[PDB]
Design a protein around this motif. Sequence first.
Motif, PDB file in Angstrom:
ATOM      1  N   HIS A   1       1.461   5.699   1.079  1.00  0.00           N
ATOM      2  CA  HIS A   1       1.205   6.861   1.941  1.00  0.00           C
ATOM      3  C   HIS A   1       1.656   8.022   1.042  1.00  0.00           C
ATOM      4  O   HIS A   1       2.742   7.954   0.462  1.00  0.00           O
ATOM      5  CB  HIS A   1       2.079   6.840   3.200  1.00  0.00           C
ATOM      6  CG  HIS A   1       1.793   5.650   4.083  1.00  0.00           C
ATOM      7  ND1 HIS A   1       0.729   5.689   4.882  1.00  0.00           N
ATOM      8  CD2 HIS A   1       2.363   4.366   4.245  1.00  0.00           C
ATOM      9  CE1 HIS A   1       0.584   4.507   5.551  1.00  0.00           C
ATOM     10  NE2 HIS A   1       1.590   3.691   5.158  1.00  0.00           N
TER      11      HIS A   1
ATOM     12  N   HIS B   1       0.858  -1.187   0.000  1.00  0.00           N
ATOM     13  CA  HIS B   1       0.000   0.000   0.000  1.00  0.00           C
ATOM     14  C   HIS B   1       0.898   1.241   0.000  1.00  0.00           C
ATOM     15  O   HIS B   1       2.127   1.133   0.145  1.00  0.00           O
ATOM     16  CB  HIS B   1      -0.931   0.008   1.226  1.00  0.00           C
ATOM     17  CG  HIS B   1      -0.167   0.089   2.531  1.00  0.00           C
ATOM     18  ND1 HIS B   1       0.212  -1.040   3.125  1.00  0.00           N
ATOM     19  CD2 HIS B   1       0.469   1.140   3.233  1.00  0.00           C
ATOM     20  CE1 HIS B   1       1.064  -0.779   4.161  1.00  0.00           C
ATOM     21  NE2 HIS B   1       1.218   0.573   4.227  1.00  0.00           N
TER      22      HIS B   1
ATOM     23  N   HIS C   1       4.838   0.612   0.883  1.00  0.00           N
ATOM     24  CA  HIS C   1       5.085  -0.397   1.917  1.00  0.00           C
ATOM     25  C   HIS C   1       4.682  -1.789   1.445  1.00  0.00           C
ATOM     26  O   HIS C   1       3.514  -2.017   1.092  1.00  0.00           O
ATOM     27  CB  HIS C   1       4.318  -0.064   3.199  1.00  0.00           C
ATOM     28  CG  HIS C   1       4.881   1.145   3.921  1.00  0.00           C
ATOM     29  ND1 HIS C   1       4.149   1.725   4.878  1.00  0.00           N
ATOM     30  CD2 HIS C   1       6.126   1.801   3.927  1.00  0.00           C
ATOM     31  CE1 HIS C   1       4.862   2.708   5.493  1.00  0.00           C
ATOM     32  NE2 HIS C   1       6.081   2.753   4.907  1.00  0.00           N
TER      33      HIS C   1
HETATM   34 ZN   LIG Z   1       2.205   1.733   5.418  1.00  0.00          ZN
END
Ligand SMILES: [Zn+2]
Length: 258
Positions: free
Chosen positions: A94, A92, A117
Amino acid sequence: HHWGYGKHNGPEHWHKDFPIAKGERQSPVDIDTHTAKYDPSLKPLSVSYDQATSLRILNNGHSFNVEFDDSQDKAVLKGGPLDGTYRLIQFHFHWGSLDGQGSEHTVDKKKYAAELHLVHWNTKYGDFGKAVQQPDGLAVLGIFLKVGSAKPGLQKVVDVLDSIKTKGKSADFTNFDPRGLLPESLDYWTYPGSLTTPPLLECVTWIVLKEPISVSSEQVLKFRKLNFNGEGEPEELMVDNWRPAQPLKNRQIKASFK
Ligand SMILES: [Zn+2]
């Protein structure tokens, strides 16, 4: 109420429901390149993603996750500072509202536009749920994103975001190859830390890659079109879903390179 990244439920409020937020090995942290210790004992990372089987892409209300079939050793990580085999379960991102912010980890205080990540769990523990309850349960590979030229490998992901605009939505996402998100070099920094979103469990061995991958402004722009909210609710753009750096405390960051 429910945790988020807003003024009233953001990072600074998390400790109320998750006291571990003020723990001894919280992430992310600022990587001070001058005090990170080069360790010649660290082995090269081994990433075997050729048999990776992606299944679905989902907007969980705080980010979007691409999930993989982790019922067998199809896409694993080993080597580096790791003992044993860690299976890839999902990746995922950010990101920020502007190009100058978005990453969770920082290098010499420098913030990147986004951070990828790649979450893996230690097979010795049987399943992800048991793994998060162990100090060496997870291995997260962090990759910085800078704005510049397009990343061809990221386009498939960017193209599907329209279908999962709001919280709770998901779509079939098969045959996606995570190898296209990797930088050329595998040099890294590593330190013991935690999940960066609640429950903030301190079960992670962080492996942060030195080399960022480049993505275009148009690509990152599409991340910014996602919504934190569910369909039929007031629209709140999913941006700045990153947690600020936490104190390093009694930890040493080791580098695999000089
Ligand atoms: Zn993360």
